[PDB]
Amino acid sequence: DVVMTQTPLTLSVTIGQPASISCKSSQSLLDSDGKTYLNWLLQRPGQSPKRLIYLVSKLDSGVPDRFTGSGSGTDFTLKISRVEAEDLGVYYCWQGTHFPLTFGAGTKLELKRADAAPTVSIFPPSSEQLTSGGASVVCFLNNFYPKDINVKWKIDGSERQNGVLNSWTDQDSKDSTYSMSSTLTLTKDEYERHNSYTCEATHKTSTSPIVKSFNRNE
Amino acid sequence: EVQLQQSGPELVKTGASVKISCKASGYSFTSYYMHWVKQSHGKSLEWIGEINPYNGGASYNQKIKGRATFTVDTSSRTAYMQFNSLTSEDSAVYYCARSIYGHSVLDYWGQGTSVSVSSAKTTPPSVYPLAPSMVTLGCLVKGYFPEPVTVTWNSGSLSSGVHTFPAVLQSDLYTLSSSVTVPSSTWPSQTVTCNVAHPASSTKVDKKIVPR
């Protein structure tokens, strides 16, 4: 198989600014018929893959002229003259000169924006879950930027580390923010042996963390 | 408009087979090749093969070891892929794609069919309400298998302030949550309900979020 190597594998772009992806093949993609079957593909979140460029530099009909493809032989480039919000997604180069068709690993393009502090919410276990004998406490850390964030759980003033599962969204296409959920799962019996439950979010937007708590006695 | 409509998500027993379909519309079916492509963990793409719907002739990536078999029904404009002897390594999203003229230049892609390969039984989710300017509510969708689930709020009438978090696997079951943020003047005065569907278990649950 022909190896397709993209660089960089991640882009972080200010809207309006140019960006570029390189693609290098382990073997020339020039055919004996005189054509070079080097292609670019975009997969946006919530969408099917879509064709961007084919035959090195030909634009798909649905693609704006902000995109250009260039290159020859073993070395290829995708350029975006001015990045727009719609450009968020994963870009693949792929070749159809040799059998089998092979794809690069993908370059993930993310957008820059102004720093935003998280909106933090904490939720006790539902009555439904407690009736079943279980207890999940959930913390949302919503609509923040940049990506890096820390969540600390405290129970009755004591830092708690185990039974915590975290999940992070992909960057939002509408506002360029991130969100994260954190779920602490205890037995109902352990849950009921404590009073206060606290979620603490540490983000670059403040020296002090954002603390949300509830008390079972309240 | 060219349309490539693929069949729904599949759970497959380890060692068993799956047959997935791609119904084409908006063009002359026998005039373009159809390709099948695997995408693992939502990232890397691997070509499985192609079929010429005019003559039924297939070509396969040799890395598949002859486990795939492509067919077409020209009368229904459908391409099929049967994939045998599945293991956990074959859990992936499978796409069909059309090429011009055929074989070289893929130009349109189906939406994908998620295939999970596992020894585990299907388990429906437990759906729990998450109740505590703007108020944030949520829905906890716990302990299901396999992916996917779909979550909506107010049957689609609340969409703007909704985030659904990717599922996390722990001890062979998935859990995810969904968040919605509405005006404090809106809830609890107006109803807010999460609607959670899990295709594999034929389950759909509506959970109203009520003040606790």
Author numbering:
A (entry chain L): 1 to 27, 27A, 27B, 27C, 27D, 27E, 28 to 213
B (entry chain H): 1 to 52, 52A, 53 to 82, 82A, 82B, 82C, 83 to 100, 100A, ...
Tell me, in the authors' exact words, what the paper reports.
The urokinase plasminogen activator (uPA) system, comprised of uPA, a specific cell surface receptor for uPA (uPAR), and serpin inhibitors of uPA such as plasminogen activator inhibitor-1 (PAI-1), plays a central role in many of these activities. Recently, we identified and developed a novel uPAR targeted monoclonal antibody that demonstrates robust antitumor effects in a number of different animal tumor models but does not block the binding of uPA to uPAR. In addition, we determined the crystal structures of the ATN-658 Fab fragment alone and in complex with uPAR, the amino terminal (uPAR binding domain) of uPA (ATF), and the somatomedin B domain (SMB) of vitronectin. Moreover, we showed that ATN-658 binding blocks the association of another integrin, α5β1, to uPAR and thus impairs integrin α5β1-mediated adhesion to extracellular matrix. These results suggest a previously unrecognized mechanism by which uPAR may function in tumor progression and a novel epitope for the therapeutic targeting of this receptor.
The crystals diffracted to only 4.5 Å, despite numerous optimization efforts on protein crystallization and X-ray data collection strategies. This is presumably due to high solvent content (76% solvent) and the presence of a long axis in the crystals (c = 391.58 Å).In order to solve this low resolution structure using molecular replacement, we also crystallized the free Fab fragment of ATN-658, and determined its structure to a high resolution (1.6 Å). The 1.6 Å crystal structure of the ATN-658 Fab alone consists of residues 1–127 and 134–212 of the heavy chain and residues 1–213 of the light chain. The antigen-binding site located at the end of the variable domains, comprised of six CDRs, is clearly defined in this antigen-free structure. The H3 loop lies in the center of the pocket surrounded by the light-chain CDRs L1, L2, and L3 and the heavy-chain CDRs H1 and H2, with both hydrophobic and hydrophilic interactions with the other CDRs. The six CDRs form a relatively flat but undulating surface, a feature of anti-protein antibodies. In addition, the conformations of the 6 CDRs in the free form are quite similar to the conformations in the antigen-bound form (RMSD of 0.49 Å for Cα atoms in 427 residues). These results indicate that ATN-658 has structurally rigid CDRs.
